[model samples]
Target: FLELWQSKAVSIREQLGLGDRPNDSYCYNSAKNSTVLQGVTFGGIPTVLLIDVSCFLFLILVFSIIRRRFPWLTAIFRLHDDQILEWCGEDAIHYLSFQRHIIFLLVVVSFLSLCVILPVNLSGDLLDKDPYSFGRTTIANLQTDNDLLWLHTIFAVIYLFLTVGFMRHHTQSIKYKEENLVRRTLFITGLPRDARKETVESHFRDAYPTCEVVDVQLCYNVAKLIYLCKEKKKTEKSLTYYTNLQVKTGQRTLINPKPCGQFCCCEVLGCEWEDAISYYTRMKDRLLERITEEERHVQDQPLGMAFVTFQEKSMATYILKDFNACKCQSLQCKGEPQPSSHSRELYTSKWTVTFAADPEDICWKNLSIQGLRWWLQWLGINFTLFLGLFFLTTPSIILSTMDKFNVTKPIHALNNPIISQFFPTLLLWSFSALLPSIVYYSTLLESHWTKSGENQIMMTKVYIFLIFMVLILPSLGLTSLDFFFRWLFDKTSSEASIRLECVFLPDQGAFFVNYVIASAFIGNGMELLRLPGLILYTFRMIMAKTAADRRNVKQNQAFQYEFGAMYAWMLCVFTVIVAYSITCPIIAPFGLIYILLKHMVDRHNLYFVYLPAKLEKGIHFAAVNQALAAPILCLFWLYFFSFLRLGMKAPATLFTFLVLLLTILVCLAHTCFGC
Candidate 1:
């Protein structure tokens, strides 16, 4: 039975394109290694890559035709960076410069890694099953407690210092003519009941002396108004979309009309259907009427917050600084005191003062959620987020499990690298496509007054989710989670701790190699091509009834960069690159390529293709700097442990420890002084 089973397993493995390796071969690799790791065929990856290249070329070909015919429309690309700023705002230039600098960062580090780390790795002999194995060129090739590993330490220190140095020096500080409205307005939350303009304005004036209040607009419950405005926009869109679609065929001059009775009782009376132009025109008119009425009604009532615009431009800054600097007793800021205070009461009386974010940036719907309602909703939203994380990680964990244990039911795509190389990247890409927006929308459920605040929340959530699904799960397999469960329920804590290892980090290194290549070449191409935007514009252009529709379609053709999603994805890629540039120096060149493609694509698209919606004011630049630091530090620790586990003890481990400590200290010092 054993012999028959072994023969059957051999046949199964061969048929599955897994080579004649042992059954527990979890990951599929094309590496010519002696480890009985499953071998995947290499044919599937290139076809997709080729198609993406061809498609991108064709997109550019079409783009050139448009540019030649209408050079004035595409002339933004000819402008310099300062001119780009003048046209697109400081945010565009800052975003573009940051991406451009990343290319430099990768070039410096990749060159350092290639020159220093590669030779050391090549000389070591940790694994050698095949002559052309990737392990021979990776840190895996190093011998246990080897002196050669000390070079790894030296380079780790170099990378840490260089990475931190680049971050420390890099600045997107663009000082434009600061606006008095933004600079002089304070967003004061935690207003007491019966607080009107009189109470709110006087409170700020008294608390921070020398501050002059020009205007105070107390927050109102504009949830209904917000809904109406959204309806108005949708109505306008439908109206405009239909207005653009005039049929000029040989047989007919008018486009077919849509049924107006789809949602009404007009069907009972056999009412006539309406044309798109008429229906949308009536819809927008009614929505506009309601919106105008609701706008005034919303101003009558007061909520817990108020926007205080000042006569002095710096007064808002003064108040925010005072509120932050207050180190006095409980119910008081630097000045006033009335007695006991819950922290909420501290704000209700003393104040939470911040410069008002963009008026349009205020998310008015959830702006009214406060007190107990806010707390409940906050908890509920977080719970739902946890569930989202759970569901999103399931397929990935399963992927990791099957990669590690060769667990299969024999139903899906089986051979020719279908399941092995191609499927995981595609499945993860599908998840990536949906994940950021899902996270963004879900995080917005919590009460956030400003859209930027919501975006910051969204950025944090998406980064965490991306890290979990993309890097952490595959690196630390789910089998470890099962062991962790055993540790929870039984006497298996020691075993579980041992089981919780980075068993699949190297396994997925090749996976990310392809992932970054596709992102750089194909993903960035799509951004430049603006295929979706093009399609939408084309669809709208054809349906024109009047010149207004044509003008509106042309005006609204380009979309803006979604920094909420853009920052998270870019952060993840950088985190992986910085972490792996040491362990697998081979991936460093690919990182360089990714950086180059991203910088070029984003620069061109931001200047010429994508329009700016709101100025980031270097806020995203700052957030990204902080966000990038934390993840790289954490992943640095992951590989630090990887070194220890791989049996490279003694002075080699000691040197690596020094590098880690130096990294943490550098980060700490930067945090201390850079602010």
Candidate 2:
């Protein structure tokens, strides 16, 4: 497989003329590594190891300390293993539900908007004062990439389209029971003025006996007609008739009228109040006859207020499974049935029905063969794109950008130790921070090369796309600014003696201002993006497909509680790290490492291969130990060596090393043993 991959790589490289000539000009290449043994400043094994160790330690701490508690909290948080699975499914559903054309349009528009807005939003501010501050240069660079808007826009559109398309397609592969316990319900058309309330109540009572009234509306005149009478008043002839009727009604009885917006009924011909009432009544009765009692009841309740009555607690699961629909039910049914009732109120609907059985559980053993096929497809498309981008684009971009600005050159040029090493240190700092993420994702994709099936593979791709969009891309944009700032600083300082004009260090101040503004701006943008994802996560907790599978297998696995806690912890950690990175470059790298490791550990056991056999406790222990330990060790080594080399004398090195080491040790100590 290595030979095959190498051959493909070679052929592609030759065709592109990437590896054919030795050019003096700097270029990014994934194959290049700075070897600590060779003492090369830019590329090295130590750096790679540092990143790995950092990731590994972070993963263990996160998985063991944070994620391990989720299963137990399942009941408390209303999260189940099945819900986690369904969350995965719904992620796909969100993608597929929207039409491709609409998605494409939305992506294009959103991308254009982001481009125009993000740069201005990201321009440097006070927080970015230090060249070492992550946000300072990153924000300005992102601002500079006027084209990034278009590129990211196109990429986002493609990403969402492909992600949703693949998820929709994969969804077909998973066999779900077509027949749920819930009965089919139809739509109700029209209701009689006096009978509407009674009809709706009868439906709910039969389906769900315990349902409490929320709100109700029985329209005597369609909303459109009432809206028109209020809007046109006495001005138009068409509305004149209804206007007079309303005035007459108002004079005789003290009643408030409904307000109209947009499409007023006065605009339509033959839409008199009596005609509207007649139409609504006819539609309601027809709708009632067509819908099932259970369906009607469910729709009438408040959006979250669902109704279900259990004859047996064992069958309580049916409430979540059973499907039902309700046409109308209003909680605030205060007024008597009058012509005015239809004008002002919006009806609330509720329903109850027998709980539907959850979808059948899927077995990893059954999926073994299917996993092979999915893995291959993943390698071909999702994995392929990721690897190509990571190896080809990322390395080249980082290396060439660093070299182009001569940031590293200053390391040897100046006589003053601090000043001489400043620029190179900055470059190294940026590289160290982002490099682990690139490698971790690479590892993730490589593993996806061996998958359980198309569903898992596509899921992996979606996962990759999400990471890139939310984290990787933004980091890259920031790195560019960092590079530019170092370059600017180098030029200004070097020319200070020759050019008196350069004395003010205007560029330096501007750079810092840029960083500050960018950090706050992008941070806000990210929060907006996260809000929807957070809501979706909550919904996923409610509808998992296999809530008890892991517990059934291990009997002791606290999957739900642990997973939710870990997820929440990760979100919190990431939020803090992002905020910190805005002001500190070093923290940014650590944060990236944290994110990568956390994701990998959280997902590692999710695939079929990692599940330990019930009988082989020792084997399980060994496997889990290796899986958990290896990465942490690698991450620790990276942080330790990097800090030491960064000129952190004995005290700083001791502190940094101890912090990283303790984190890893704790994670190791907490490894679970089957009780």
Candidate 3:
């Protein structure tokens, strides 16, 4: 096989232009004391897991102890689901329930994985891998074609499929609740410019033949109106700032008419200066004329989109049940295909419709720039995102090195020191503080119709970013793929070297375990401490310039919970657990702790401390559920390729492959049909 691969190496090399390089950047390449990787051993798990669990327990208990002093912490624990829902949004209940479901599912699957798979692996006489490490309990210790592996295959089938089944079932139960007129709305996006404002409603009613009240509120390209609105707000805030300062000093403050005095260089940029009050007074009058002028034209010129209140909930269900449209439930898309062309009639295409959210949720400004402009904007944003993820090599490599190796050589060196110590902390602090926020800001550029839409975009991008950060980044360093293919084509790379690299994967069990376990302290423990919030709030109070500023500081600003990004992080941890579930049985139990604490802590905060910016109701929950596909799909590739390193190509491998394909296909159908 090696001779045949090397013979056709050139052709294979052409197929994939990767993993063929040779270098000193070997992350998991095992330098001096790598003999442990291929050596025989058992009872690999020592007292470390027990110790970590104790510390994990200690972390949990310490938080509970602090809750005694902090009575607010104790308060949320007493809140019922009804109370939590009322306090949080309708979205809160669904999110909490999903988390609860996840815990239940993990307990069921992980128990079987640990019970069945663990001992089978331990009893295997394959005896070529480590005796005192994770390798013994991992698949590495099993014979190449061991009958034991079929059980592993069956376990994988159950774990992966069970998750899928649970996801589908729970979301299936998340059926819509609201039947109000607000819920019975259809928001159409993209009609041609020639759509007759007078005829669109009558046209829609004629087509649907239902709709108790067809209230068509068509959106217009409110560019000038929106621009004026922004201008008004800008001038208003500046006027207020100067007026407040003027009153404080009991004198007129200088204003630059030409440059408007916000920046320090206003004097240099300005050709005219005046008393701030007088300048704003004139500006306000000018803005009123333009703003009012645009308002009159705003309704007259439609942006080729409309929000129609179908009024009858059943009518909306019938119209929106078509396959051409999908979004949130309350918002249904009754998108139409091109109408019959006769002499190029105006409004030839069907209206692209979905349901309207709350009036507050609507991002009116983003309503403009539909059609060609919106399409162009979307293209640019997507390309930028693709490029952004691809070029994160430096940060990715740094993290991978930090996760897999310190100055790595000795067998237990990674566990004993620097890399394991820092990876989780660096990722948690660095990615949480910066990366998610970066994604949040970037999503602002993509024109979305509502706050929830914007948030969903941010959530998905953050999810992808986290996947790269945690899963792909560290593996990118190993050049394992490079080595694996290299061994196929040439004689230089040894078989055991590939096994060592493959063995490198199971080693990740510890770091992720540590990451999950460490969350006990960092996630819930320090979060509840919140000395930073208290200290910062005090500093703002101290810095208050006047009574007004003091009032602003005194008002409690609710904690902004970015649940999109938050849930994305949860999925990432879950992905890690899934990836390692069969490979490293030790990992399965840890997520139970991770998830249970998350459910408790997050529920507590939502019930008491946090304030909602928004939710897509069950849409947000459903989107997160769909995102679960990522980890399951990840399992398909991760372990399938693990077989390559060990040269394990038994009948069970093929059986597992077919099971995975079927599961993935079903997942695809579920997403396609439901979404």
Q: What would the per-residue lDDT of candidate 2 be over residues 517-556, giving only the tens digit for each residue?
A: 2222222222222333445555555433336534333442
RMSD after Cα superposition, model 1: 8.3
Query: lDDT scores for all predictions?
Result: 0.58, 0.34, 0.58
Name the 10 consecutive residues with the lowest summed lDDT in model 2.
34-43
Model 2 alpha-carbon drift over 4 Å, by segment: 1-382, 388-573, 576-645, 668-671
By summed lDDT, the worst window of 10 consecutive residues in model 1 runs over 26-35
Give the C-alpha miss distance for residue 327 in model 3, angstroms: 13
TM-score of 1: 0.69
Candidate 1 on 1-675: residue-level lDDT in tens? 436422353344333333454543222222222223322222234555666678667866776787677623344446566767566665665666666666777787677567767777778433323343455566545555446645555555555567666665555233334333566566666777665676555554554555565666777778878878788878777655544454432231222334533445344445545455666677778888887887778756767776766565554454455543333333443654322323343364456666577776677776778666888987888777767767776775566336434323233234433355545665667577667667667665565766655666667777777877676665554435444443443334444344332232434246666677667666666566665666777767765445554556656666666776778888888887766665566778877877876765555556555666675444555454654574455447555555545655456555556656665665655443343
lDDT of 3 by residue, 271-335 (tens): 45567788787889899998878778766766666666655566577766553445323344554
Candidate 1 clashing pairs, residues 3+ apart or interchain: 26-403, 26-404, 34-129, 126-141, 244-543, 244-544, 245-543, 245-544
lDDT of the structure predicted as candidate 2 = 0.34
TM-score of each: 0.69, 0.24, 0.71
- The TM-score between candidate 3 and the true structure equals 0.71
Deviation from native of the Cα of residue 74 in model 1, angstroms: 16
Show the lowest summed lDDT stretch of 10 residues, model 3.
Answer: 36-45
Cα RMSD to the true fold for all candidates: 8.3, 26.8, 10.0
